[PDB]
Each structure stands twice: as structure tokens, then as C-alpha cells.
Design a protein around this nucleic acid. Structure first.
Ligand code: ZN
Ligand code: ZN
Ligand code: ZN
Ligand code: ZN
Lengths: 85, 95, 86, 96
DNA sequence: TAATGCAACACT
DNA sequence: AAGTGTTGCATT
């Protein structure tokens, strides 16, 4: 129930909302949770790791604001914390 | 004036289930649908739920297929065969 | 190096030489070994189990005439020996 | 009416096809030539397609049996090529 | 609209 | 000409 989420693409059928390109079956994707006018619930808006910070997303502390952060690898967890700084 | 949330086409496969009787629809068979949100997967969500031509007309009212519209107003109807077009015209009359 | 061969389709890209239809990825297919003018060797002519006996081929004792007969589920080799005399 | 039967030209349908003139992959979309011959390592398939880069092909024009008699325009599927590609092969595979 | 199944293409 | 590997459909 957080504003953001991050994980390894469960499938390669995802699509970045920025460049409208596909996302690899294991690429690092970050989504923005938005309300759905169709059933009253949150839906993921997936972006590429680079495309995510492009649409403007100033995150102070990702470790808490982003959901599933503590599941990723330390190498990426810091690569995200750094890119967010 | 073809409807937007009501389409007709030939079963692209035999693994689609008719939501009017819950049994599979054989490939090539004519099938109808309504663009509605699937309660089990709303996150998609406004998709296609298919019915047999018979199962559809049996629920014409509940599906919101007003007596105002006809079969010819179905989306993708033009791409049907003659024996199929007229078949739906008798099953889904206008007014 | 036998005249015939039988096995479970190693892939579904095979095609019966009788009805020219595809063969399931595990269906019971029987082929006739024919000479190849390409590499000096025999080449399988796959048929459906039903299509095989249709082209008119009478096999006395399949267990020896057919290659790979002993190398398949017991349930099948009996079905082969049965429809053999028929 | 004058197009060769065992020599074709087309755009790489994928990036997983290997040029048998240098043994390296041919990137998708790239123009590629072929000869309808029987692959020695898979003779059971009979006459198929073995692909080469346009350059790797002309480098073996003689050994591949592409006589100086024929030209690039006589390639099977040549008509379905782009202009900048057609003329590109015409200079690489001249007639006589 | 993205996660399964499937089915069909591309190379050989 | 049929296995292997890959890509893209089809349904939800
Ligand atoms: Zn992107
Ligand atoms: Zn039904
Ligand atoms: Zn057959
Ligand atoms: Zn090359």
C-alpha cells in the first residue's frame, strides 16, 4: 500500500509509459501506483529504470517510500538510492 | 452507427470460455462479446467476455443489448460471412 | 538398420506421407526407411499409426522387423503386435 | 522470366541466422543473399537456404556458382527490395 | 493491460 | 524436411 513499487519484470509483456517500449523479462522496472476508475484500486504504471526518473519522481528515501525495496539486491538498492539522491 | 462495446468475430481459438454457460467455444465458431470489466481481473480491465450467439441472446436484456440496436450494428460484423450475418440478424433483430 | 522404425514423435513438426497432416509431439508414428539420393543413407517416411497400415504394408513379426520396438511403453508394443496381423 | 531459381535475396527475418561466408551472425533487417544448396551437415533436409552477407557472397561469387552471366536483378525476391538496396547489389553483382 | 499458456515462425 | 530455439498470438 505504498506510492511506488519496484521489482524484476515478472514478464516481458510490460510496457514503459514514457517511451512506450517493452520491458525485458528480468529488467529493473519501477511503477507509480495510480487509482483505477474501473474498480477502485491501485494499478501499476511501469517505467524503465531510466524512464522512471525521467517523468519526474523526486524520492527522498526509496527504502521506505518504494514497496518491495528490501527484496532487491544491495547493488541495485544503492543504485536506486543514489539515483534518487 | 455500430456499437462500441459489442463485437462479433470467429473464435480465434478453442480455449475461450462462454460466460453464458461456462463451456468452451470451439475455434471458427461465431462468438459475441461485451466490453466490460472482469470482476476477477479488474486491473486490465475493460476487456472482452465472450458468449455463444445463443447464450448471448438469452441474456440480451441483462447484458444491456437494448432492443434499439440490431445485429448489424455489431463491431466487426462486416467481416462476417453471409450465412452468418443473416443468422445473427434473425437472432438479434432491431425494432 | 531395419526396414521400419517406431517411436514417440520427438517433435510435432513431422508430417504423415498419407494424409499430409501434422503429427502430435508424442503420438505413435511409424516410418518406412527409404534410400536417400542426398547423403547415401536411409531416411524416415513418417506416417500416423492408422495411416501407416493404410498404405498397404503387411508386417509378420513387428518385434524384429521394426526398429525401436522394444524401446517403448509396454502398453504400446502390444498394440503394435495386435494391429499387426490386422 | 529471367530470374534465377537457386539464388535469392531478402532482409534478415531475424538476427539468429549465420553467414556461411564468415561464420558470424546476420543482424535482422540486413540484406542477405543465399544459394539453394544441400547443407552437408544436414543432407536429410535436402536443398535449403544458406545465407551470406552481400560482401561475403560476392567474395565467393565463383565458388558459389554465380556466373558472370547473371546479375543482381535476376535474384529471386529482388523486386521486393528497396531502391538504395537494389542499386547497391547492382554494383556488387554486375552482369556482363 | 500484463501474466500465463499455447501456437507458429525462423534456421537449419 | 523435421528438431530446436525463439517470437509472437490468444485469453483473462
Ligand atoms: Zn521506457
Ligand atoms: Zn455459451
Ligand atoms: Zn496420416
Ligand atoms: Zn558474412
Amino acid at each position: 500500500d505504498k506510492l511506488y513499487r519496484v521489482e524484476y519484470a515478472k514478464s516481458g509483456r510490460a510496457s514503459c509509459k514514457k517511451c512506450s517500449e517493452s520491458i525485458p523479462k528480468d529488467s529493473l522496472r519501477m511503477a507509480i501506483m495510480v487509482q483505477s476508475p474501473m474498480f477502485d484500486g491501485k494499478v501499476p504504471h511501469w517505467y524503465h529504470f531510466s524512464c522512471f526518473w525521467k517523468v519526474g519522481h523526486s524520492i527522498r528515501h526509496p527504502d521506505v517510500e518504494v514497496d518491495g525495496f528490501s527484496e532487491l539486491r544491495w547493488d541495485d538498492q544503492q543504485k536506486v538510492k543514489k539515483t534518487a539522491e | 452507427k455500430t456499437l462500441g462495446d459489442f463485437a462479433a468475430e470467429y473464435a480465434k481459438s478453442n480455449r475461450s470460455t462462454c460466460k453464458g454457460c461456462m463451456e468452451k467455444i470451439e475455434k471458427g465458431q461465431v462468438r459475441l462479446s461485451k466490453k466490460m470489466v472482469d470482476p476477477e481481473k479488474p486491473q486490465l480491465g475493460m476487456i472482452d467476455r465472450w458468449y455463444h450467439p445463443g447464450c448471448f441472446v438469452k441474456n440480451r436484456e441483462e447484458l444491456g443489448f437494448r432492443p434499439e440496436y440490431s445485429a448489424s450494428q455489431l463491431k466487426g460484423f462486416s467481416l462476417l460471412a453471409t450465412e452468418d450475418k443473416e443468422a445473427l440478424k434473425k437472432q438479434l433483430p432491431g425494432v
